[PDB]
Amino acid sequence: LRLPPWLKTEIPMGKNYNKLKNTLRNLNLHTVCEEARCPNIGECWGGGEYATATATIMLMGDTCTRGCRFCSVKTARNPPPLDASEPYNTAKAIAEWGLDYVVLTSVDRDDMPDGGAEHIAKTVSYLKERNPKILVECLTPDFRGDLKAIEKVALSGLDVYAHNVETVPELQSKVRDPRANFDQSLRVLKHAKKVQPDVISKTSIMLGLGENDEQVYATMKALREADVDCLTLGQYMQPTRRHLKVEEYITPEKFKYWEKVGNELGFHYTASGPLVRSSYKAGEFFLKNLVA
Ligand SMILES: C[S@@+](CC[C@H](N)C(=O)[O-])C[C@H]1O[C@@H](n2cnc3c(N)ncnc32)[C@H](O)[C@@H]1O
Ligand SMILES: *C(=O)CCCC[C@@H](S)CC
Ligand code: SF4
């Protein structure tokens, strides 16, 4: 039981924030920020000085078919069916908020035959046909290794394909649902490079789940062997008392250390920090390292 000082946040202020909160409920859309109970809700939904207010619309309802021990998203054996109007409503809300870069994610839908690859592809297609110059990033589930489902999402005009390994291979069984493993997540990023050679790969790992420095170095080196372009490192924070406890709060100095090691291995940009999540300032990192 430890409580750190550098992981403290603020109660969400509602200057430019209720516009996003009321838009998500007008279209009956969900977001991973509210379900996962992220502390960076105020920073991402409301730019302090000059930060475009962005969000992470979570598709296919607020209930996941999997039960990951680090995630607080609701889990049910059979979630409600797909909403056909979700891909169309998402494209309207994103263009309404004036975003030049958007990130989209969804819960795992193991009950769907394609796992929702067609539903995600229609959300990106409706969003790119409406605004061709907008940048889209998809935080895609593993689809249980369905190479056809991964191909359908990667060929939807996607700019950055994102799928997280979450933690080191030695902690896949304790942290993630058994339907997801380390080698499976790498085959999601590898196949996205084969089907779409000009795509940008991106993944996110979490620290504080019992991993050591030796295990983290081998994971990043294996990701570079998978030709993964981008990497994200962040401190795992306990969502609820029912979930996993934090094992070790990584110091901000060591968080900066892995940023240099990522630059050594050749990662196009390594975003590391205690509060750094997968989509945390993802558009700001795109403008600083992925142009030229
Ligand atoms: C809910 S997942 C959605 C992607 C997809 N459903 C999957 O997991 O394969 C979105 C992100 O939230 C993050 N997340 C959930 N709970 C977290 C926590 N307690 N601390 C840090 N990150 C968390 C995970 O890292 C994950 O990458
Ligand atoms: C608490 O740590 C949950 C963090 C959720 C991060 C979402 S908003 C983006 C990956
Ligand atoms: S797959 Fe795991 S991390 Fe993703 S929404 Fe479901 S329980 Fe949460």
Residue with tokens 């907008």: 134
> What does the DSSP assignment read for 220-276?
HHHHHHTT--EEEEEE----STTSPPP-----HHHHHHHHHHHHHHT-SEEEE-TT-
- Residue bearing the CA closest to ligand 2, atom 5: 38
* 8 A C-beta contact, residue 128 and residue 134: yes
* 8 A C-beta contact, residue 264 and residue 148: no
Pick the atom of ligand 1 nearest to 235's CA: 21
Angle at 230 between CA 102 and CA 232, to 5 degrees: 80
Q: Which amino acid is at 130?
A: R
Resolution, rounded to a tenth of an Å? 2.6
Pick the atom of ligand 3 nearest to 58's CA: 5
Pick the atom of ligand 3 nearest to 67's CA: 7
- Which ligand number lies closest to the CA of residue 58? 1
Helix axes 213-225, 182-195, angle to 10 degrees: 30
Tell me the binding residues. 33, 38, 44, 64, 68, 71, 279
How far apart are the C-alpha atoms of 292 and 287, rounded to whole Å? 10
CA atoms within 13 A on the CB side of 148: 4
Q: Of 71, 65, 59, 50, give the one whose Cα is nearest residue 24.
A: 59
The Å distance, Cα 41 to ligand 2 centre, comes to 9
- Which ligand number lies closest to the CA of residue 185? 1
Tell me the binding residues for [4Fe-4S] cluster. 33, 38, 44, 64, 68, 71, 279
- Residue bearing the CA closest to ligand 1, atom 14: 71
Cα distances from 259 to residues 110, 185, 196, 247, in angstroms, run 35, 22, 27, 21
Q: Which residues in 57-93 are b (16+ Cβ under 10 Å) and which e? A: bbbbbbbbbbebebbebebeeebeebbeebbebbbbb
- Residue bearing the CA closest to ligand 1, atom 22: 236
The Å distance, Cα 178 to ligand 3 centre, comes to 12
How far apart are the C-alpha atoms of 43 and 100, rounded to whole Å? 18
Q: Which residues in 217-244 are b (16+ Cβ under 10 Å) and which e? A: eebbebbbebebbbbbbbbbbebeeeeb
Q: Which residues pair with 7 in a beta bridge?
A: none
> What does the DSSP assignment read for 111-157?
TSTTTTHHHHHHHHHHHHHH-TT-EEEEE---GGG-HHHHHHHHTSS
* 8 A C-beta contact, residue 62 and residue 36: no
3-state secondary structure of 176: coil
3-state secondary structure of 184: helix
Pick the atom of ligand 2 nearest to 41's CA: 8
Cα distances from 11 to residues 15, 79, 276, in angstroms, run 13, 31, 18
- Which ligand number lies closest to the CA of residue 246? 1
CATH code given to domain 18-289: 3.20.20.70
Residue with tokens 């372009």: 229
The Å distance, Cα 208 to ligand 3 centre, comes to 18
How far apart are the C-alpha atoms of 130 and 98, rounded to whole Å? 12
DSSP 3-state percent helix, strand, coil across the chain (nearest 5)? 40, 15, 45
